[PDB]
Scaffold this active site. Structure first.
Site, PDB file in Angstrom:
ATOM      1  N   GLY C 144     -21.727  13.347  15.892  1.00 19.88           N
ATOM      2  CA  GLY C 144     -21.062  12.583  16.932  1.00 19.88           C
ATOM      3  C   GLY C 144     -21.164  11.092  16.670  1.00 19.88           C
ATOM      4  O   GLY C 144     -20.225  10.340  16.927  1.00 19.88           O
ATOM      5  N   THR C 145     -22.314  10.669  16.156  1.00 22.41           N
ATOM      6  CA  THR C 145     -22.538   9.272  15.805  1.00 22.41           C
ATOM      7  C   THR C 145     -21.875   8.943  14.472  1.00 22.41           C
ATOM      8  O   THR C 145     -21.148   7.958  14.358  1.00 22.41           O
ATOM      9  CB  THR C 145     -24.041   8.952  15.698  1.00 22.41           C
ATOM     10  OG1 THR C 145     -24.688   9.248  16.942  1.00 22.41           O
ATOM     11  CG2 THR C 145     -24.253   7.483  15.352  1.00 22.41           C
ATOM     12  N   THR C 179     -24.316  22.894  10.017  1.00 19.25           N
ATOM     13  CA  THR C 179     -23.188  22.295  10.718  1.00 19.25           C
ATOM     14  C   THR C 179     -23.105  22.799  12.146  1.00 19.25           C
ATOM     15  O   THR C 179     -23.679  23.830  12.486  1.00 19.25           O
ATOM     16  CB  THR C 179     -21.847  22.589  10.029  1.00 19.25           C
ATOM     17  OG1 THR C 179     -21.777  23.976   9.677  1.00 19.25           O
ATOM     18  CG2 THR C 179     -21.692  21.747   8.790  1.00 19.25           C
ATOM     19  N   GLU C 183     -17.782  20.306  14.387  1.00 15.17           N
ATOM     20  CA  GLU C 183     -17.676  19.351  13.284  1.00 15.17           C
ATOM     21  C   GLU C 183     -16.290  19.220  12.619  1.00 15.17           C
ATOM     22  O   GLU C 183     -15.937  18.131  12.162  1.00 15.17           O
ATOM     23  CB  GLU C 183     -18.777  19.592  12.244  1.00 15.17           C
ATOM     24  CG  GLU C 183     -20.178  19.465  12.827  1.00 15.17           C
ATOM     25  CD  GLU C 183     -21.242  19.221  11.776  1.00 15.17           C
ATOM     26  OE1 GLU C 183     -22.435  19.195  12.143  1.00 15.17           O
ATOM     27  OE2 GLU C 183     -20.889  19.046  10.591  1.00 15.17           O
ATOM     28  N   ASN C 206     -21.426  18.990   1.374  1.00 16.11           N
ATOM     29  CA  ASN C 206     -22.773  19.553   1.423  1.00 16.11           C
ATOM     30  C   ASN C 206     -22.879  20.899   0.713  1.00 16.11           C
ATOM     31  O   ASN C 206     -23.946  21.264   0.229  1.00 16.11           O
ATOM     32  CB  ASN C 206     -23.259  19.687   2.868  1.00 16.11           C
ATOM     33  CG  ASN C 206     -24.020  18.466   3.343  1.00 16.11           C
ATOM     34  OD1 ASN C 206     -24.458  17.642   2.540  1.00 16.11           O
ATOM     35  ND2 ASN C 206     -24.192  18.347   4.655  1.00 16.11           N
ATOM     36  N   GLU C 254     -12.650  -3.994  -7.311  1.00 20.89           N
ATOM     37  CA  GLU C 254     -12.337  -3.232  -8.520  1.00 20.89           C
ATOM     38  C   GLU C 254     -12.250  -1.727  -8.275  1.00 20.89           C
ATOM     39  O   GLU C 254     -11.503  -1.028  -8.960  1.00 20.89           O
ATOM     40  CB  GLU C 254     -13.345  -3.520  -9.637  1.00 20.89           C
ATOM     41  CG  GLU C 254     -13.083  -4.808 -10.401  1.00 20.89           C
ATOM     42  CD  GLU C 254     -13.764  -4.831 -11.756  1.00 20.89           C
ATOM     43  OE1 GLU C 254     -14.306  -5.892 -12.133  1.00 20.89           O
ATOM     44  OE2 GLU C 254     -13.753  -3.791 -12.448  1.00 20.89           O
TER      45      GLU C 254
HETATM   46  N1  LIG Z   1     -26.571  15.537   2.880  1.00 22.65           N
HETATM   47  C1  LIG Z   1     -27.080  15.348   4.093  1.00 22.65           C
HETATM   48  N2  LIG Z   1     -26.371  15.755   5.202  1.00 22.65           N
HETATM   49  C2  LIG Z   1     -26.881  15.568   6.439  1.00 22.65           C
HETATM   50  C3  LIG Z   1     -28.119  14.965   6.613  1.00 22.65           C
HETATM   51  N3  LIG Z   1     -28.372  14.909   7.940  1.00 22.65           N
HETATM   52  C4  LIG Z   1     -27.327  15.456   8.603  1.00 22.65           C
HETATM   53  N4  LIG Z   1     -26.402  15.878   7.683  1.00 22.65           N
HETATM   54  C5  LIG Z   1     -25.105  16.511   7.962  1.00 22.65           C
HETATM   55  O1  LIG Z   1     -24.519  15.818   9.045  1.00 22.65           O
HETATM   56  C6  LIG Z   1     -23.881  16.712   9.935  1.00 22.65           C
HETATM   57  C7  LIG Z   1     -24.408  16.468  11.343  1.00 22.65           C
HETATM   58  O2  LIG Z   1     -24.275  15.102  11.653  1.00 22.65           O
HETATM   59  P1  LIG Z   1     -25.546  14.145  11.891  1.00 22.65           P
HETATM   60  O3  LIG Z   1     -25.509  12.968  10.945  1.00 22.65           O
HETATM   61  O4  LIG Z   1     -26.819  14.937  11.723  1.00 22.65           O
HETATM   62  O5  LIG Z   1     -25.401  13.700  13.436  1.00 22.65           O
HETATM   63  P2  LIG Z   1     -25.333  12.154  13.884  1.00 22.65           P
HETATM   64  O6  LIG Z   1     -24.524  11.319  12.920  1.00 22.65           O
HETATM   65  O7  LIG Z   1     -26.736  11.611  14.020  1.00 22.65           O
HETATM   66  O8  LIG Z   1     -24.600  12.154  15.321  1.00 22.65           O
HETATM   67  P3  LIG Z   1     -25.250  12.826  16.636  1.00 22.65           P
HETATM   68  O9  LIG Z   1     -24.461  14.053  17.015  1.00 22.65           O
HETATM   69  O10 LIG Z   1     -25.169  11.832  17.769  1.00 22.65           O
HETATM   70  O11 LIG Z   1     -26.695  13.193  16.368  1.00 22.65           O
HETATM   71  C8  LIG Z   1     -24.192  18.119   9.468  1.00 22.65           C
HETATM   72  O12 LIG Z   1     -23.029  18.657   8.884  1.00 22.65           O
HETATM   73  C9  LIG Z   1     -25.267  17.952   8.416  1.00 22.65           C
HETATM   74  O13 LIG Z   1     -25.073  18.855   7.355  1.00 22.65           O
HETATM   75  C10 LIG Z   1     -28.838  14.550   5.500  1.00 22.65           C
HETATM   76  O14 LIG Z   1     -29.938  14.013   5.634  1.00 22.65           O
HETATM   77  N5  LIG Z   1     -28.313  14.746   4.241  1.00 22.65           N
HETATM   78  C1  LIG Z   2     -32.064  22.687  21.477  1.00 27.74           C
HETATM   79  O1  LIG Z   2     -31.936  23.893  20.727  1.00 27.74           O
HETATM   80  C2  LIG Z   2     -30.744  24.225  20.133  1.00 27.74           C
HETATM   81  C3  LIG Z   2     -29.728  23.277  19.988  1.00 27.74           C
HETATM   82  C4  LIG Z   2     -28.504  23.582  19.389  1.00 27.74           C
HETATM   83  C5  LIG Z   2     -28.230  24.944  18.871  1.00 27.74           C
HETATM   84  C6  LIG Z   2     -29.274  25.986  19.001  1.00 27.74           C
HETATM   85  O2  LIG Z   2     -29.077  27.258  18.539  1.00 27.74           O
HETATM   86  C7  LIG Z   2     -29.371  27.551  17.174  1.00 27.74           C
HETATM   87  C8  LIG Z   2     -30.555  25.612  19.639  1.00 27.74           C
HETATM   88  O3  LIG Z   2     -31.543  26.545  19.786  1.00 27.74           O
HETATM   89  C9  LIG Z   2     -31.477  27.415  20.912  1.00 27.74           C
HETATM   90  C10 LIG Z   2     -26.901  25.249  18.247  1.00 27.74           C
HETATM   91  C11 LIG Z   2     -26.285  26.343  18.721  1.00 27.74           C
HETATM   92  C12 LIG Z   2     -25.007  26.952  18.376  1.00 27.74           C
HETATM   93  C13 LIG Z   2     -24.030  26.481  17.594  1.00 27.74           C
HETATM   94  O4  LIG Z   2     -22.856  27.323  17.438  1.00 27.74           O
HETATM   95  C14 LIG Z   2     -22.728  28.515  18.205  1.00 27.74           C
HETATM   96  C15 LIG Z   2     -24.033  25.210  16.878  1.00 27.74           C
HETATM   97  O5  LIG Z   2     -22.973  24.861  16.387  1.00 27.74           O
HETATM   98  C16 LIG Z   2     -25.192  24.320  16.670  1.00 27.74           C
HETATM   99  C17 LIG Z   2     -26.412  24.323  17.233  1.00 27.74           C
HETATM  100  C18 LIG Z   2     -27.372  23.255  16.795  1.00 27.74           C
HETATM  101  N1  LIG Z   2     -27.076  22.778  15.454  1.00 27.74           N
HETATM  102  C19 LIG Z   2     -27.369  23.485  14.364  1.00 27.74           C
HETATM  103  C20 LIG Z   2     -26.961  22.871  13.056  1.00 27.74           C
HETATM  104  O6  LIG Z   2     -27.931  24.565  14.424  1.00 27.74           O
HETATM  105  C21 LIG Z   2     -27.330  22.090  17.784  1.00 27.74           C
HETATM  106  C22 LIG Z   2     -27.426  22.532  19.246  1.00 27.74           C
END
Ligand SMILES: Nc1nc2c(ncn2[C@@H]2O[C@H](COP(=O)(O)OP(=O)(O)OP(=O)(O)O)[C@@H](O)[C@H]2O)c(=O)[nH]1
Ligand SMILES: COc1cc2c(c(OC)c1OC)-c1ccc(OC)c(=O)cc1[C@@H](NC(C)=O)CC2
Ligand SMILES: Nc1ncnc2c1ncn2[C@@H]1O[C@H](COP(=O)(O)OP(=O)(O)CP(=O)(O)O)[C@@H](O)[C@H]1O
Ligand SMILES: Nc1nc2c(ncn2[C@@H]2O[C@H](COP(=O)(O)OP(=O)(O)O)[C@@H](O)[C@H]2O)c(=O)[nH]1
Ligand SMILES: [Ca+2]
Ligand SMILES: [Ca+2]
Ligand SMILES: [Mg+2]
Ligand SMILES: [Mg+2]
Ligand SMILES: [Mg+2]
Lengths: 54, 319, 439, 422
Positions: C144-145, C179, C183, C206, C254
């Protein structure tokens, strides 16, 4: 196959090899976008608070 | 339990393949837009290769080679043969062809024009009639091998399967689509040996059933009439041509180091002249099969092309 | 000397930023406390490394970088980490709560309240620059960020720094590497808004890094540290020309000039070789020909696609280590007669080559073995459109049912922006097709 | 710092709430006196999410205990971990709610509601950054159902941008106290549809069947039922309470689990339900098994919109990933194809007490409509004859309000069926 523009230095070198010749929104506009979305949030919340008041 | 999808309902060959898969109890058919599959029987046009091999925990296989259209199009085949050093203009087993737009080889075709009978496709002895009709202009083999009795023309269809390891398998059973009308070198029914044409404009099925002569009969004919075998006089050249075309395009279409795997069934069409020389006519990327050969060939596909990647719980000649 | 400012947004950007600056310090001989014994000019200078590092009177070399995240947990690990003395506290900016994987929340809701603070902190660094080239922006597509706030930032940067080039390092989402289901939405939304504000963007899938770490490093389940250290090597190879003496890609301009003929098509494909496991006791050093040939293997690309079925617009070869021009040409000549390299008719079928004699630096205790030579190929291929197609298809699946849309609308975003963003992506795919495909 | 304010209302809400606090206090190494005696700093890293830190480094649950009669809260205070709760966070009346939604929501509850909000307000002020609210209650009674939903409404009014999370116990004739339970449940569901972001549907019928058929308990008690709920609540909140790969809060959960605002009712699950350790394939198999579900709905009668899974214990992360992918790939028809990769898994190295490894299931399935259908039929069977209505009209309610609640729940059912055929 021609090598052109060969530049050299202590750190390394660079060159180009050819194999075949060829045949914004202003600050004001951004502010409006952000404020328009903010006001849409305010309206939706006011509707919620109205609904809860009822 | 393996999973697969079907995205070509008009496919005669793979309608039988999917049937056999279900009859093993180890394969399950999914909805056409379900991404969680192991095998894809894809569509002929705009197959989304780009979406293959990106699903986690899934080995994905598809019944088409991306880029094989270069071999299976009229103009693309001519361009491929001329511009490939491993094929070249001195190809010898491919008739003199020129690509003509209605690049391009219009002046070059006239230079060779000046037996002067050609054929346009995408038959006339006058170049003016050919151009005004228009594509590729190919030299018409005025001296084809004629079957007797009947004094008739024919073509040879060979089915070739190439698996994920790029092994080239030639089906033992080929077919001769013969003309039921006598050949006349002076009405394009005895000149065109297509099944759809013979079943319409023709004396159809007079000599053989449905104008289809198979290898055993044709071999016996060659032994009786020319004192030679099908293997020696014809199949050696066929196997050579097939191998030449597929090896040439291999590095462009091979899925050896890809995130997904590919196999494909090909339909090679050959013409034989009176000197017992074999000429390549064209290559079919989505061919149909002979009615009596569907059972054997489709099972052969499942065995070497599908089960080799997805093992469960030879009719091919390896080239 | 002309300066470059690096901006790291969201978790992915920050953690990758950590890996890069760790590597940068090792390459330039900079200790975690900021001291650099190699630098004889104390408290000043205009060397090539000064593009990424400023200097204080105490001899400390401070990264020209800004870290921004809407929640503090990730950046807090920088504030108390190994390189806590390296960064000025102002450079490390954190908010209260994150964008919750919601583009609209990061862009509109939270972004509005923190954008001026970020720009002000960036202005601080800009005032230390005698001739700022532009910015390097690191972020994810999925966060989101990383998606929401970055696009807003890129817009404001175009306003406040109109003449400055902006380069992107973007993390393309993959289900193999953590992910969220939304996303694909965030990816399309951020690509649409950022498109006209980015001069050149390097996408890193990734999935590709994940497979490279499994295949080449024998790591069953790669961590973020494993992934980022690999990414940092690629990033280092791309930015080495800005930080060291050379004549190729010496300024941000460049990159566009050499890789981006058409503004919208500014996503070069990166390919790196070799990636060798450090645990591997016995390994043969690959030759110049071998690592160059490996640049045309899909398994070594940062984005999984097939360049054989696309067309090249530009190609750059960035070597590091024991490499001489003679061996490069001998490799290129050989490769052309084996590989399927098709350039567009309106472009010179050629290669711009850059060579840095210093072999790739690796983090001590890392998973990557030290090699005597390595290469990063940057090629603008229409084949990278496969990544857009995959992503757009996943967008279409959910958006047809309007799934998850209410979350974005609830943050003040209009539903129309979804379609607007998708139509822009549809046009982008069409641009790749017109350039790359024949009838 | 992602603090959560916990609220427990009514008899069921307080009894399950108490057990939840007993379990996680043990996991975090907090003794009944509120003192930490753990062996790992991983227990204290995210302790602030559920606990406030007192003067002498004591940890006090951010919990508010609500009831309209002092009985159950006297039991809680005299319970094993009864002294850990903040004395001022005990808010109770004397009248009781008599298993009547109207009394909880409109009459008796309305007199006590402001006192609760005062404590809620006080707890929110001690939060660095309030993440959201968590409520435990039943839907079949009066206080938890009626006053609980009144509280939720009042909280949303004062904190409109905060996440509201409920663990709601659904009534069933098999484990029933009064015949008016379908009335109370239907009225509550109407509230939950509008005013919660996440609701874990805990069906007492499922809890009973698990105790009887699986756990081999011939005579299940509420204590036995609550053991399952307590274990489920612990696993569900694992990524909230423990450090790990997953950087996420309640809002991130809601965003990814809830594709459509009204469809936020989840089917919880748990495995295993012995000294023999379970292999990863066994955990995954049981976790998706209907017999391990706690909503008494057959997942094969519908489709999964979204799925979350949490594995706890030291295990192969590759094997976990393989098994989870296996289930999806072997049963692709039970997952919607218009939400790519709708099954996410998280792993925590720290196992719960008594198990070397375990798995918690959180499913947003269209099969949950069976739960609401069941309640709706029981509702209609009585309402068509206006049976037992005088208990409610005597508290100022009119028949129209019942008709609306019934209509809205039937709409909820139709909306689930709508996406089951998508
Ligand atoms: N290669 C790599 N990918 C990352 C890393 N951290 C997060 N990602 C990827 O970033 C995606 C999630 O976005 P984030 O950067 O974690 O979230 P954010 O930019 O902090 O935004 P928020 O939702 O507000 O937390 C996922 O698809 C992850 O695979 C990292 O340290 N290395
Ligand atoms: C605070 O704890 C949780 C928070 C989340 C999730 C989750 O289930 C694995 C949790 O544990 C209960 C989560 C859930 C489901 C998702 O898709 C159905 C998703 O895209 C993504 C997620 C979570 N993200 C990931 C990469 O697993 C973020 C939100
Ligand atoms: N140069 C040539 N000389 C003699 N005969 C030729 C010829 N080119 C084609 N033919 C005849 O062409 C007929 C085959 O059709 P052709 O291979 O040219 O395309 P087609 O219309 O069959 C498309 P497809 O094979 O995909 O169905 C054969 O019957 C053969 O007799
Ligand atoms: N699982 C469980 N359910 C309970 C418990 N106590 C009551 N119930 C259920 O909740 C409903 C009664 O509501 P209750 O909480 O006792 O009334 P309240 O005090 O007014 O909220 C009935 O459907 C009971 O089956 C308990 O301890 N555990
Ligand atoms: Ca200096
Ligand atoms: Ca009273
Ligand atoms: Mg034909
Ligand atoms: Mg974050
Ligand atoms: Mg009771």
């Amino acid at each position: 196959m021609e090598v052109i523009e060969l530049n050299k230095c202590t750190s390394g070198q660079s060159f180009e090899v050819i194999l075949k010749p060829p045949s914004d929104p202003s600050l004001e506009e951004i502010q409006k976008k952000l404020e328009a979305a903010e006001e849409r949030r305010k309206y939706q919340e006011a509707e919620l608070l109205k609904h809860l008041a009822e | 339990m393996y999973t697969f999808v079907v995205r070509d309902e008009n496919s005669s060959v793979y309608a039988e393949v999917s049937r056999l898969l279900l009859a093993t109890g180890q394969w399950k058919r999914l909805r056409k837009d379900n991404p969680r599959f192991n095998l894809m029987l894809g569509e002929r046009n705009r197959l989304p290769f780009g979406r293959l091999g990106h699903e986690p925990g899934l080995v994905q296989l598809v019944n088409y080679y991306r880029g094989a259209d270069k071999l299976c199009r009229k103009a693309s085949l001519v361009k491929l043969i001329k511009t490939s050093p491993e094929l070249s203009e001195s190809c010898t087993w491919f008739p003199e062809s020129y690509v003509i737009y209605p690049t391009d080889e219009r002046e070059v075709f006239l230079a060779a024009y000046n037996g002067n009978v050609w054929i346009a496709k995408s038959i006339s002895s006058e170049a003016s009639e050919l151009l005004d009709f228009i594509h590729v202009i190919q030299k018409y083999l005025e001296k084809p091998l004629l079957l007797e009795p009947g004094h008739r023309k024919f073509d040879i269809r060979s089915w070739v399967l190439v698996d994920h390891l790029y092994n080239i398998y030639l089906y033992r059973e080929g077919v001769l689509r013969t003309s039921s009308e006598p050949y006349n070198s002076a009405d394009k029914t005895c000149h065109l040996t297509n099944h759809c044409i013979q079943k319409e404009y023709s004396n159809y099925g007079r000599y053989e059933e449905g104008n289809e002569m198979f290898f055993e009969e044709f071999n016996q004919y060659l032994m009786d009439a020319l004192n030679t075998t099908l293997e020696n006089s014809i199949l050696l050249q066929i196997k050579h041509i097939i191998r030449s075309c597929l090896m040439c395009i291999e590095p462009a279409i091979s899925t050896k180091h890809l995130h997904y795997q590919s196999f494909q069934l090909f339909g090679f069409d050959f013409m034989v002249d009176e000197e017992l020389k074999v000429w390549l006519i064209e290559v079919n990327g989505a061919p149909a099969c002979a009615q009596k050969l569907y059972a054997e060939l489709c099972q052969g596909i499942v065995d070497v092309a599908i089960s080799s990647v997805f093992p469960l719980a030879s009719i091919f000649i390896k080239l | 000397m002309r300066e470059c400012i690096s901006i790291h947004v969201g978790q992915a950007g920050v953690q990758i930023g950590n890996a890069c600056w760790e590597l940068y310090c090792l390459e330039h001989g900079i200790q975690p406390d900021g001291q650099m014994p190699s630098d004889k000019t104390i408290g000043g200078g205009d060397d090539s490394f000064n593009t990424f590092f400023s200097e204080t009177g105490a001899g400390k070399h401070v990264p020209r970088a800004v870290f921004v995240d809407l929640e503090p947990t990730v950046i807090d690990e920088v504030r108390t980490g190994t390189y806590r003395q390296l960064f000025h506290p102002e450079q490390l900016i954190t908010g209260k709560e994150d964008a919750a994987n919601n583009y609209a929340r990061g862009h509109y809701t939270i972004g509005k309240e923190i954008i001026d603070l970020v720009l002000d902190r960036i202005r601080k660094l800009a005032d230390q620059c005698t001739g700022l080239q532009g910015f390097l922006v690191f972020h994810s597509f999925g966060g989101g960020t990383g998606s929401g706030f970055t696009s807003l930032l890129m817009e404001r940067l175009s306003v406040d720094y109109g003449k400055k080039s902006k380069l992107e390092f973007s993390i393309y989402p993959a289900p193999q590497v953590s992910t969220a289901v939304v996303e694909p939405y965030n990816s399309i939304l951020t690509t649409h808004t950022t498109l006209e504000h980015s001069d050149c963007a390097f996408m890193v899938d990734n999935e590709a890094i994940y497979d490279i770490c499994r295949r080449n490093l024998d790591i069953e389940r790669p961590t973020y540290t494993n992934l980022n250290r690999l990414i940092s090597q690629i990033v280092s190879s791309i930015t080495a020309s800005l930080r060291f003496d050379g004549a190729l890609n010496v300024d941000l301009t460049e990159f566009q000039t050499n890789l981006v003929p058409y503004p919208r098509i500014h996503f070069p494909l990166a390919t790196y070789a070799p990636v060798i496991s450090a645990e591997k006791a016995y390994h043969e050093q690959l030759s110049v020909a071998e690592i160059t040939n490996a640049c045309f293997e899909p398994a070594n690309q940062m984005v999984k696609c097939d360049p054989r079925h696309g067309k090249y617009m530009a190609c750059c070869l960035l070597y590091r280590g024991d490499v001489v021009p003679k061996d490069v040409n001998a490799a290129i000549a050989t490769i052309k007669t084996k590989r399927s390299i098709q350039f567009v008719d309106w472009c010179p079928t050629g290669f711009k080559v850059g060579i840095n004699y210093q072999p790739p630096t690796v983090v001590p205790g890392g998973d990557l073995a030290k090699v005597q030579r390595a290469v990063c190929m940057l090629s603008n291929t229409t084949a990278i459109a496969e990544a857009w197609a995959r992503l757009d298809h996943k967008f279409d699946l959910m958006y047809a049912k309007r799934a998850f849309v209410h979350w974005y609308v609830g943050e003040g975003m209009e539903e129309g922006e979804f379609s607007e963003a998708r139509e822009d992506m549809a046009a982008l795919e069409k641009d790749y097709e017109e350039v790359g495909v024949d009838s | 710092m992602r603090e959560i304010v916990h609220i427990q209302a009514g008899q069921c809400g307080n009894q399950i709430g108490a057990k939840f606090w007993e379990v996680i206090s043990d996991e975090h190494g907090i003794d009944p006196t509120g003192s930490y005696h753990g062996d790992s700093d991983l227990q204290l890293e995210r302790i602030n999410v559920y606990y406030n830190e007192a003067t002498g480094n004591k940890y006090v649950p951010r919990a508010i205990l609500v009831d309209l009669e002092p009985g159950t809260m006297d039991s809680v205070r005299s319970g094993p971990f009864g002294q850990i709760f903040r004395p001022d966070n005990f808010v109770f009346g004397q009248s009781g709610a008599g298993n009547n939604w109207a009394k909880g929501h409109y009459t008796e509850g309305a007199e006590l509601v402001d006192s609760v909000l005062d404590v809620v307000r006080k707890e929110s002020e001690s939060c660095d950054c309030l993440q959201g609210f968590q409520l435990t209650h039943s839907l079949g009674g009066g206080t938890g159902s009626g006053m609980g939903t009144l509280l939720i409404s009042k909280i949303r009014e004062e904190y409109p941008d905060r996440i509201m999370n409920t663990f709601s116990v659904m009534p069933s004739p098999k484990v029933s106290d009064t015949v008016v339970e379908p009335y109370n449940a239907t009225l509550s569901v109407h509230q939950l549809v509008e005013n919660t972001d996440e609701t874990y549907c805990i069906d007492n019928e499922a809890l009973y069947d698990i105790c009887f058929r699986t756990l081999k308990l011939t005579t299940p008690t509420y204590g036995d039922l609550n053991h399952l709920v307590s274990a489920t609540m612990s696993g569900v909140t694992t990524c909230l309470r423990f450090p790990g790969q997953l950087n996420a809060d309640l809002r991130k959960l809601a965003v990814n689990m809830v594709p459509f605002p009204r469809l936020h009712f989840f089917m919880p699950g748990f495995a295993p339900l012995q000294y023999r350790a379970l292999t990863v394939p066994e955990l995954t198999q049981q976790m998706f098994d209907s017999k391990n579900m706690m909503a008494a709905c057959d997942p094969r009668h519908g489709r999964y919109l979204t799925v979350a899974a949490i594995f706890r214990g030291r295990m192969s992360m590759k094997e976990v990933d393989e098994q989870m992918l296996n289930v999806q790939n072997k049963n692709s028809s039970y997952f919607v194809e218009w939400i790519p990769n709708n099954v996410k898994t998280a792993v925590c190295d720290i196992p719960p007490r008594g198990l070397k490894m375990s798995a918690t299931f959180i499913g947003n399935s269209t099969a949950i409509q069976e739960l609401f259908k069941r309640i709706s039929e029981q509702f209609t069977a009585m309402f068509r004859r206006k049976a037992f209505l005088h208990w409610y009209t005597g508290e100022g309610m009119d028949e129209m309000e019942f008709t609306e609640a019934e209509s809205n729940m039937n709409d909820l059912v139709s909306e689930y069926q709508q996406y089951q055929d998508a």
